[PDB]
Every structure is written in C-alpha cells, then in structure tokens.
Design a protein around this ligand. Structure first.
Ligand SMILES: C=C[C@]1(C)C[C@@H](OC(=O)CSCCN(CC)CC)[C@]2(C)[C@H](C)CC[C@]3(CCC(=O)[C@H]32)[C@@H](C)[C@@H]1O
Ligand SMILES: [Cl-]
Ligand SMILES: [Cl-]
Ligand SMILES: [Mg+2]
Ligand SMILES: [Mg+2]
Ligand SMILES: [Mg+2]
Ligand SMILES: [Mg+2]
Ligand SMILES: [Mg+2]
Ligand SMILES: [Mg+2]
Ligand SMILES: [Mg+2]
Ligand SMILES: [Mg+2]
Ligand SMILES: [Mg+2]
Ligand SMILES: [Mg+2]
Ligand SMILES: [Mg+2]
Ligand SMILES: [Mg+2]
Ligand SMILES: [Mg+2]
Ligand SMILES: [Mg+2]
Ligand SMILES: [Mg+2]
Ligand SMILES: [Mg+2]
Ligand SMILES: [Mg+2]
Ligand SMILES: [Mg+2]
Ligand SMILES: [Mg+2]
Ligand code: NA
Ligand code: NA
Ligand code: NA
Ligand code: NA
Ligand code: NA
Ligand code: NA
Ligand code: NA
Ligand code: NA
Ligand code: NA
Ligand code: NA
Ligand code: NA
Ligand code: NA
Ligand code: NA
Ligand code: NA
Ligand code: NA
Ligand SMILES: [Sr+2]
Ligand SMILES: [Sr+2]
Ligand SMILES: [Sr+2]
Ligand SMILES: [Sr+2]
Ligand SMILES: [Sr+2]
Ligand SMILES: [Sr+2]
Ligand SMILES: [Sr+2]
Ligand SMILES: [Sr+2]
Ligand SMILES: [Sr+2]
Ligand SMILES: [Sr+2]
Ligand SMILES: [Sr+2]
Ligand SMILES: [Sr+2]
Ligand SMILES: [Sr+2]
Ligand SMILES: [Sr+2]
Ligand SMILES: [Sr+2]
Ligand SMILES: [Sr+2]
Ligand SMILES: [Sr+2]
Ligand SMILES: [Sr+2]
Ligand SMILES: [Sr+2]
Ligand SMILES: [Sr+2]
Ligand SMILES: [Sr+2]
Ligand SMILES: [Sr+2]
Ligand SMILES: [Sr+2]
Ligand SMILES: [Sr+2]
Ligand SMILES: [Sr+2]
Ligand SMILES: [Sr+2]
Lengths: 132, 337, 53
RNA sequence: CGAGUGGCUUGCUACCUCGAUGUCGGUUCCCUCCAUCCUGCCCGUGCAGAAGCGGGCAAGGGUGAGGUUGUUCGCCUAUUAAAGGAGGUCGUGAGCUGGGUUUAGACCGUCGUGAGACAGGUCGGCUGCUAUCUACUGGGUGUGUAGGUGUCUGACAAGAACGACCGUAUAGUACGAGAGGAACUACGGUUGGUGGCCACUGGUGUACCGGUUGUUCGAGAGAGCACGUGCCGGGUAGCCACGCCACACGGGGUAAGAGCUGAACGCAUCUAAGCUCGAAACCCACUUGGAAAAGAGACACCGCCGAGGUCCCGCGUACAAGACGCGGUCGAUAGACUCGGGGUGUGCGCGUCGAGGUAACGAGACGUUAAGCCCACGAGCACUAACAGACCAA
RNA sequence: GGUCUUAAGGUAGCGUAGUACCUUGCCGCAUCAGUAGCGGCUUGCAUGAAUGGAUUAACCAGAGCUUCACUGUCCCAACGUUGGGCCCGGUGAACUGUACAUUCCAGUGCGGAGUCUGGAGACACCCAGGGGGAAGCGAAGACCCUAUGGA
RNA sequence: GCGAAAGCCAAGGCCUGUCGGGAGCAACCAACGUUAGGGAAUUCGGCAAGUUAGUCCCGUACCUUCGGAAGAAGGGAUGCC
C-alpha cells in the first residue's frame, strides 16, 4: 500500500475487541484478519493503525450484528511514530466500517482520527470530524 | 502437518566464537573508479544522540521537511600512514613482497611495535618498481595506525595498527600517491577520504556478552505453556533425530555470544566536524566529553563505547549520493534522563 | 515547543503526544509526567513542576 | 487393454529383537526428497485484453492464524503470493505433554446360568537414572611447524542473507463493440527472515527518593520486622524489543526455451561440429571462519645475552576456570574530595495560621526550603592505592 | 400377517442417552468458523418401570458447555530476587565396566555396525554444556504363544 | 482483631532445621517479583497464575420440598483530628 508517513507498533491482534467509530449501528467490532498480511509459525496476526482489517460485529443492532464487514483501523492505544520523532497515542482503539471502493458505510464518524489515515483512505478523511 | 518456519538464527556468521583481533580486518575493498586515494578510515565509538535533518531524497514526498534521525557519535582523530606494502601475483594468490617505512615516528608507537632504527626504503621501493615493470604487482596497501592518545576518553595509548588499500587510478600513479603521503609523516584526517552525506561501511567487533543460551543466542522459543513448568524453560526440544546418530553443527546450542566481527553495510555519514557540537550534557555515558575531530554515523554501530571501528566507501550502495545534508539541529540533552 | 503539563522546554525528537476522548491534545516531556496526570495530581499543586515555580 | 517406478497406505511373510529397541496424537529442533502449492524463466490454447486452463525447466526461499474433535485424517472461517506433499526407528518421552490406546476402581448397553466377556460407550487412574564413551556447541593447555613483535595471505569452510507482496507513475493508456483492462521502467512502503545497536518510545531496575498501614525501641527524631521490597508512587546506569539502524546491482556458465551459420540428405533443419541468448536455480559478487594448509605460508622490523614474554600491581571495551584487553609515576587505572549531569519531590528544628477546646491538647497548612536524601555516568584533582621486587628467554 | 416359537409380545414415561451402530443423525440456538454444549424431532443397531422409570429444591476437591471479570496461558519474550550452578579449602560416596575404542558417509552382515568392506576425515590433553548415538543405564517382558505350569 | 486468626513483641529458648571461602555472581535449573499493547489467540481442558476479598448501608431474580436460593446479582461507604 501507499506509505503512512509514520512507523506503527501493531497494537491489535486477531480476536481483538475494538470500537466502531461511526453511526452504522455497530458499537463493538472484533478483528478477524488483516488485509494483505501473512505471518509466521506461532504468531497472532497483528493489526495496526491504518490497516484495512476484516471484522465481525460483536455488539449492536439486530440487523447489523453477526455480519462480516471490512473496516479501517482509525485509532489505537499503542504509540505510533511521526517523522519528527514524536510518539502519538490515542484514548481507545477504534475503527470505521468501509465498503468495496473503501468508502465509509456511515455518514458521521465519532471521535478523532490520525493524519496518516487521511493519505490512504481519503474518502474517510473527507467525512472526518477531528484530525490529529 | 507440522507448519513451516525458517531456522532459528543465521548460519552465515559462523562459527560463533570469540574474535582474534579486536581491531576489525576487512576482506573486501572497493572497485577502482577515479582519483587515487586511501580506501578507509578508523575511529573510536563515543555514543548516541539524535539530529534533525532536511530530507535529501528527491523520490520522497518529504523533500524539504524536518526529519529526526538517530546518530552514533564516533570520534575520528587523524591517523598516520606509517608504511606502504606490495603484493606479488603468485599462483597461490597475493603474497606480500616488501614494505617502505618512515623516519618520523610517534613517541608512543613503541608500545605495540618494534620500531625500525635502520631501514632501507630506497632499494625496497626499487623492488616494487621492478615487480611493476615485470607485470606481477598486485594491489598496493598502506600500513595505517591510530593515535588513541588523541582521544582523552580512551585509556588506551597503545596504537591499533591495521592495513588499508589504495586504489582509484592506474597502478603507476597510485604507487606514487601512496609514497607521497608516507614521506611527509602520513598525517590524514577523515576529510581526506570521506565527504559528508556519503555511504560508508562500518566494521566492528560487537559487545561482549559471554556465554549465553539458545534463546538469546539463536533466538529460539522459550518452552511454552505446560512445557515451561516441568523443569525445562530455556532448553530446546532435541539435538537431532535418531538417524543421523550425531548432533549437527546447525542445531541451536549454547556458547559464546558477542565479541564477533561484523561489517555493517551502507552507513550514511551525516556530518564530519570538529569541536564540541555533538557532546552530551554530563558527558557521554561510560565514555566522557567529546571535544575534537569526529564523525556522525546514522543509526547504530557495532561494538561498545570505547571500541575501535573502521570505515570504508560502500562496496554495495543502493541509493545515489546526496552529499552534505542540511543539519539543522544536533541534540545536546543528557542521556541520564 | 513547550510542554502542555510541566512547562518544560521539550527537546525536539523526544516525546509523546496523548490525544483525548473529545479530541484535545497533551504533550509530555518525559514518562514521569504522563504517569502523574493519570494519578490525578495537578501540575500547579506539585512543587517540582516548572508551572508552579 | 498393456508396460512399469515408488516404498507414503493396506495386506502377506515370520528373517531380526521376549535376561524389555517405551505407544498414538501433539510439541520443540535439525538435515533431506520432488512426484512443484506460491515465487523465477519458458511451451500450447477452445491465447484480443484481463483473470484462467494444460505442459516444460527448477528444491533458493516460502507454504501462516484460527472453530469442532485426543485425533493422524477431515469438515469449517477469515486472511495469503500460496497457505504443496513426503523421508529421517510411521525423525524426536536418558526433551516435553499424557488428551487417545492398554492395568488394578465404577457405570450403561449387548451376551453369558455364572465367574465374566466386548477390536461397544463412559468417569477416575504414575512418566525412574549424578553421563564412562562417542557426537556437536562454545572455552583452555601442550606438542609439531623451528628467538620476538606487528601486519597479511587463502587452500578450504558456512550463508538465504536475503525471500515476498502492496501501492504510485506508466494509464483509464496498449487491447476490446463495450464491459472491462494489462506491460517494460522508475519510484515509495509492508511482511517474513537475518545481523547489530539503545539518542528516542517502552520494559525492568528487592540502586535510590517518597507516601502509608501493624508493631516494637517511652513520645519525637530516627530505625528493625511484615520472604527474602509490608504495600502503594516515581524511577537513573545497565540489559532489553514492543524501539532504532543496515541486509544489491551487475557480471560468468546453463536448464526448459527462442534462435543464427550448417551438413550428413544439392533442399530443408537450432545440432551432428560451431555460435548468440535464456531461470528466484549454479559459479562469482558480499558477509563469517580460516597457518595444523605435514607443501605445516608471505612481508616489515627487532633481538640471539638480551628482543620479547610471564609473575606481580590498578582495573575492564573481557569474563563460568582458563582466556582476552587496557593502564602501572615520562602515569588519571581505581578510590576519596569538588564540580557537572541525573533520581526523588520540598529535610530535621523553629515561625505564623488551624476545626475547635476553659486550659492542656491539636490532624493539618504556609514559610524557612528547586529544599533534604540518593546515584552503577562524566569532568577536575596525583590526596590514597598502581609500590617493592621475582622469573623465564634464542 | 391383517397368528408362530417359548408364557406374554414394551403400557407411563424417557429417548441419538454415561445406552444409538449408522453418526460430525436433521432442525434450531451460539461462534467469523462449534465432531463440543443446550433445546426440539427420534422408526430406540440393542431405552423403560424397585434388573426400578420419570422429576427435582438443596448438597458436591464428581464429568461436559457458555458469558461477565482477570491475567505473561499465548502473541514474545525482557529485567530483577534468593538458593544452587562456576573457582578455592575440607569431606567424600554410587550407578556402570568382554575387550579394543578420534569418528563420519555408504555398503555388507541374522534384514537396525565406533570395531566387517570401501572411502572420507582424524595432532594430544583438559573446562563448561545441552543430551543425537552407544538399538545408553535400570528390570531373566506384565503383552503374546508355549508348559500334559501355579492360584 | 470476631478470633486460641495474621503481623509485630515479651517471659523463656536459640543462632545445632550445624561445613565454609570467592566471582555484579555467565549459561542452565528451583522458588519468585514487575512486564508496554492485545486478552485464552495458549491447551484435551484457563493446567498455572490471577481476579474478588474484612465491616456497614441500599438492594437481590428464576425456582423451591417453603427450609432454601442468598453473601445471588448489582450500587454506595470505609483514614486522621
Ligand atoms: C511393554 C513393552 C514396551 C514398554 C512397549 C511395547 O509395547 C507393547 O509391548 C504392547 S503392550 C504395552 C503396554 N505394556 C505395559 C507398558 C503392557 C504390558 C513396544 C511398543 C512394542 C509393542 C514391543 C517391544 C517394546 C520395545 C520396542 C517397542 O516399541 C516396545 C517393548 C519391549 C517395550 O518394553
Ligand atoms: Cl487470520
Ligand atoms: Cl515448548
Ligand atoms: Mg501452533
Ligand atoms: Mg537515557
Ligand atoms: Mg528523558
Ligand atoms: Mg522372558
Ligand atoms: Mg534406544
Ligand atoms: Mg520434474
Ligand atoms: Mg533445500
Ligand atoms: Mg515416530
Ligand atoms: Mg530421544
Ligand atoms: Mg521417559
Ligand atoms: Mg477422551
Ligand atoms: Mg482417560
Ligand atoms: Mg535423567
Ligand atoms: Mg445430540
Ligand atoms: Mg452428553
Ligand atoms: Mg494375562
Ligand atoms: Mg488351575
Ligand atoms: Mg502485558
Ligand atoms: Mg491450537
Ligand atoms: Na526438574
Ligand atoms: Na528415541
Ligand atoms: Na516397484
Ligand atoms: Na511394509
Ligand atoms: Na510424538
Ligand atoms: Na524449494
Ligand atoms: Na486441526
Ligand atoms: Na521408536
Ligand atoms: Na510421544
Ligand atoms: Na515419560
Ligand atoms: Na542469467
Ligand atoms: Na430390557
Ligand atoms: Na464431602
Ligand atoms: Na512472569
Ligand atoms: Na546423548
Ligand atoms: Sr513429522
Ligand atoms: Sr585487513
Ligand atoms: Sr576472506
Ligand atoms: Sr513433569
Ligand atoms: Sr546408526
Ligand atoms: Sr528432478
Ligand atoms: Sr508458477
Ligand atoms: Sr498412523
Ligand atoms: Sr473421519
Ligand atoms: Sr491418558
Ligand atoms: Sr473394571
Ligand atoms: Sr474398548
Ligand atoms: Sr611427531
Ligand atoms: Sr498498477
Ligand atoms: Sr471502467
Ligand atoms: Sr526487610
Ligand atoms: Sr538449446
Ligand atoms: Sr605454521
Ligand atoms: Sr412406544
Ligand atoms: Sr551435564
Ligand atoms: Sr527474648
Ligand atoms: Sr558441625
Ligand atoms: Sr516500578
Ligand atoms: Sr478456549
Ligand atoms: Sr482453542
Ligand atoms: Sr461490592
């Protein structure tokens, strides 16, 4: 993929319960896979900020629950590294649901986003509230 | 069906034993391009600090922006090229012929060497020119040496001597270039061979870690789960199968870790300067105050603070030279925080 | 830049930027200060901070 | 229908072991095979492109994470370039696990007059040993080569030291009615593997500073104890990974293959002689080892009555013994003292306030006080200790 | 089949069960995914009435499953603590020993060789190690068959 | 302190659960502490470890043989002067 412009330390795993930062009716999301990643023997597939991940809805509305939808990691708790050497970390680990053409499933996204996710998934950025 | 996995540790840096010379010994030297000169310098490691730069790469979208880059501070005081050596092309490889020595030596060079009192440079030089005329002269290298007494933070005064190749021009014009440095006193700084912004190769003997186990040494798995409580924690599954009824040298075992010679490739020189610009507040940890000739090497460098490191123009570079970077800020903050 | 907690002159290429729930931004010069905030201690009330003196 | 190769399944035999060669499945760790799942280069096509289909060369590298089940096998989910298969006593229990099989206990179903049975199910049900030899990983001491120091060489040896994907431009271009939609090349990043390093982020830090609970030394101050820190907070050096740095291009010869000149065979023909090209594969490149290479190496210097080393002394860039490295007064090697740089977070005592209370008494706050206490780093400083002196040796 | 054997010929319930072979039965719940677990169906290889059947509050170091919470169980390993481990004094055993024995790659042999054949390799001694090999040590196999054996 | 509970301390007994010396003291093992992010992905199985925790107040479901369930659950409080 296109460079992030920052070094991440993968703060999530497969089976990790993260938040759904949108209005889709999805509250809690559970990571299943990390698009394009191939691991090694005996390693939980790690996910980081700005990764298109395959997800399943844990908590939410009856019509949205039990669905296997794709999403992008918007926020994470583990510090990421900006070029100027500064580290950045968020309050929680969150993601927004996305479609085939990488457009957000909702309209309004909750909480702050990172400026690195903007370059890659711009259709999510031109729908973002706050950008840090 | 037993999932695949690459073997633990590399099998190229073998055998993992203690090094013979703490002083790195190169086995490969650069190709001959233009101007005749020495193919390498050497210094003593000092410590680390970060430096802010301006992105020199025209392929990067960050071209022009401030970027923080880590830098290894290495003091590089002027060396003395005390001699010149020649190799004859024998069917057994490249065997040495003769050496051309000086007159003016260093007051404390007799701490390692048996300093010559009566030498004949003239007729030895004649033998090299007759071997050149014959067409059997190989590569010409200079016996270089360091001045540890120039570094106040290093307790060693006993000079580290090492051989360094000269190349670039025709075999005739480089033999003469070498002889010219020698007749003066052999004084040469880093400015003579290296320009800032260039990619060099730092060779050094690593930090001494003593005898360490398989997990640390070859990065093998610690015993997992239930298998960790039965009395086996950091010991491997087995030494091999039934047949071959012998333990292979490829199986991760215990032994000596560290004090191995490594040749760390493509190291960018960020700045070559003199004075107290890279020094730290409170001095460098387990080293001391840097004031004088130095080099700023990007990233890390093999060996501990006080050990001798060696430089060479990159034998295998990937990126095109981006000379003299705009070094905006160099940190001075204490490494005791 | 200056620290959003202690008021200490942060060395560039050294530091952590903590983003808040709402979206606010706090910078810390070292780990010492990050931990002091999570404890519930205030910079003005603690004598050692460059904010107090 | 016919001809075979393999030794992974099953079956047959009963050669080997009954004075015991420990089971299955799993695990960990190592070498290998090719009958190739991916990656490289190719041939054909029901080859427009695109995504395929089928075949050839090829074992360098890769071939992952999970749900049920003891399972091997298998069914299933999502990622992937792909998530290949097999051998090594169905690799591996003087390595592990002990879920399954296969003890003594018990239940159910079937059979049995009955004890009891079952290639039916089920619950519970143990894992010994101080390594002699050899093997390999690392570490020393002698001998040989035949006085010492420093620098090298390179017979050989090891490597995957690199593999792989994604994205950008090429380009909405070639191609195609359209839908749809590439390449050569130049770039950026990601993953797996590899080696090194710690400025930064993080971890640790029973150094250290602080708060505080019980109790004991009368209170105070200051201390012990509470598992080898009572607990809670912060945490330097160091070591670390979750942090950071670096890990080609190109050549040379081939394979399958595309071809050129070309005859036997007047033509034709890539092949028989000859030649130009062509794989991630082979050699080189690169990295590491490497004078014990018995052809037991080369150069420079120094010395053979003195070169050099050993002991000794002060210590680490070293360290399980040994080894190694530096310094030893022509000296800063270690300690003390002083700075500097750091940790903690405001000392004991006294002073003011203090809910109150007749007073005694008073938890506490402010000031004195970036205070006090502390430091595995650095600088300065010969004050202390590197003194005195032994031995070997052409 | 719409009696026959041998007396009768499975009623209440319960049911793919600790009993069901087929079987990972089919439907459903739950999970991304569930040979598991729970519910329903159930022709039950071969459930079933004191050989007791069914139900159950409470009880249980009894077997199975799911959720919340927690965590170094794992992703993936790091630093630290104490007693060892390593060196010095003293004390001072044993298991095991046909002989020789520096091995390795193949082969051969009673078909599982350090010792045979052919090669390769190999200077001697010593320290620490983790245990690949000696079909390692330990036990005249408990399995299996045999004996005109025992209980 | 509910306590013949823990922890600390007397009276009393002892330093004889009777070998020592040295190395920041390595690997490796036994007990064990703290580990960022994730949180059972480990494994036959949460095995191991962990979490909760005393006392007071509010509050407490299905079911039930009316005894119980139940300390269900859940929520608040807790020192010193
Ligand atoms: C018991 C012998 C065991 C330990 C295991 C044995 O397996 C059996 O003999 C089958 S019965 C196994 C269980 N045994 C108790 C351990 C029942 C008496 C098994 C696997 C074989 C089948 C017979 C030969 C063998 C040695 C070689 C081997 O594989 C062993 C014997 C000599 C070994 O001692
Ligand atoms: Cl996955
Ligand atoms: Cl294990
Ligand atoms: Mg696994
Ligand atoms: Mg620091
Ligand atoms: Mg800091
Ligand atoms: Mg017998
Ligand atoms: Mg055996
Ligand atoms: Mg083939
Ligand atoms: Mg191979
Ligand atoms: Mg086996
Ligand atoms: Mg074994
Ligand atoms: Mg055993
Ligand atoms: Mg079972
Ligand atoms: Mg069982
Ligand atoms: Mg044993
Ligand atoms: Mg069922
Ligand atoms: Mg059941
Ligand atoms: Mg029997
Ligand atoms: Mg009888
Ligand atoms: Mg953690
Ligand atoms: Mg598993
Ligand atoms: Na044990
Ligand atoms: Na075995
Ligand atoms: Na055959
Ligand atoms: Na067979
Ligand atoms: Na096994
Ligand atoms: Na291969
Ligand atoms: Na499986
Ligand atoms: Na076996
Ligand atoms: Na086993
Ligand atoms: Na066992
Ligand atoms: Na080629
Ligand atoms: Na019956
Ligand atoms: Na009981
Ligand atoms: Na732990
Ligand atoms: Na062994
Ligand atoms: Sr196997
Ligand atoms: Sr050299
Ligand atoms: Sr070499
Ligand atoms: Sr055990
Ligand atoms: Sr064998
Ligand atoms: Sr082949
Ligand atoms: Sr292919
Ligand atoms: Sr089998
Ligand atoms: Sr099956
Ligand atoms: Sr069992
Ligand atoms: Sr029984
Ligand atoms: Sr059975
Ligand atoms: Sr001899
Ligand atoms: Sr493209
Ligand atoms: Sr289109
Ligand atoms: Sr104590
Ligand atoms: Sr050809
Ligand atoms: Sr020699
Ligand atoms: Sr009926
Ligand atoms: Sr041992
Ligand atoms: Sr007493
Ligand atoms: Sr005694
Ligand atoms: Sr701490
Ligand atoms: Sr589980
Ligand atoms: Sr599982
Ligand atoms: Sr409560």
């Amino acid at each position: 993929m296109e460079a992030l412009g920052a070094d991440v330390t993968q703060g999530l795993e497969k089976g990790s319960l993260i938040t759904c930062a949108d209005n889709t009716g999805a509250r809690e999301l559970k990571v299943i896979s990390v698009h394009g990643y191939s691991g090694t023997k005996n390693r939980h597939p790690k996910a980081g900020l700005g990764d298109k991940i395959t997800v399943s809805v844990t908590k939410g509305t009856p019509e949205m629950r039990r669905q296997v939808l794709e999403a992008v990691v918007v926020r994470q708790r583990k510090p990421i590294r900006r070029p100027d050497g500064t580290r950045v970390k968020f309050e929680d680990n969150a993601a927004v649901i996305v479609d085939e053409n990488e457009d957000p499933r909702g309209t309004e996204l909750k909480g702050p986003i990172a400026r690195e996710v903007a370059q890659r998934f711009g259709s999510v950025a031109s729908a973002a509230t706050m950008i840090v | 069906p037993q999932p695949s996995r690459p073997r633990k540790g590399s099998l190229g840096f073998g055998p993992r034993k203690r090094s013979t010379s703490e002083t790195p010994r190169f086995n490969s030297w650069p190709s001959d391009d233009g101007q005749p000169g020495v193919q390498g310098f050497a210094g003593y490691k000092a410590g680390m600090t970060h430096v802010v730069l301006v992105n020199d790469e025209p392929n990067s979208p960050r071209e022009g922006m401030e970027e923080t880059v880590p830098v290894t501070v290495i003091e590089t005081p002027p060396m003395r090229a005390v001699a010149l050596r020649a190799y004859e092309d024998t069917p057994y490889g490249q065997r040495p012929l003769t050496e051309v020595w000086t007159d003016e030596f260093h007051s404390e060079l007799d701490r390692t060497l048996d300093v010559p009192e009566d030498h004949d440079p003239d007729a030895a030089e004649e033998q090299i020119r007759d071997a050149h005329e014959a067409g059997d002269l190989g590569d010409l290298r200079l016996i270089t040496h360091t001045v540890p007494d120039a570094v106040p933070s290093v307790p060693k005064k006993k000079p580290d001597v090492m051989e360094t190749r000269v190349g670039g021009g025709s075999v005739s014009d480089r033999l003469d270039h070498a002889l010219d440095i020698v007749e003066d006193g052999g004084e040469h700084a880093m400015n003579d061979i290296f320009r800032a912004g260039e990619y060099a190769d730092v060779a050094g003997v690593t930090k001494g870690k003593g005898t360490q186990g398989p997990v640390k040494r070859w990065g093998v798995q610690k015993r997992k789960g239930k298998h960790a409580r039965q009395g086996w924690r950091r010991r491997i599954g087995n030494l091999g199968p039934w047949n071959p009824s012998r333990v292979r040298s490829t199986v991760p075992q215990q032994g000596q870790t560290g004090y191995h010679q490594r040749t760390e490739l493509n190291k960018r020189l960020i700045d070559i300067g003199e004075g107290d610009e890279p020094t730290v507040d409170g001095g460098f940890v387990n080293y001391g105050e840097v004031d004088g000739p130095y080099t700023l090497v990007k990233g890390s460098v093999p060996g501990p603070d006080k050990r001798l490191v060696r430089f060479r123009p990159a034998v295998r570079p990937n990126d095109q030279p981006r000379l003299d970077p705009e070094v905006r800020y160099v940190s001075n903050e204490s490494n005791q925080g | 830049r200056e620290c959003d907690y202690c008021g200490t002159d942060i060395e560039p290429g050294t530091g952590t930027m903590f983003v808040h729930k709402d979206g606010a931004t706090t910078h810390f010069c070292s780990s010492k200060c990050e931990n002091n905030a999570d404890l519930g201690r205030e910079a003005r009330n603690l004598e050692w901070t460059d904010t107090a003196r």
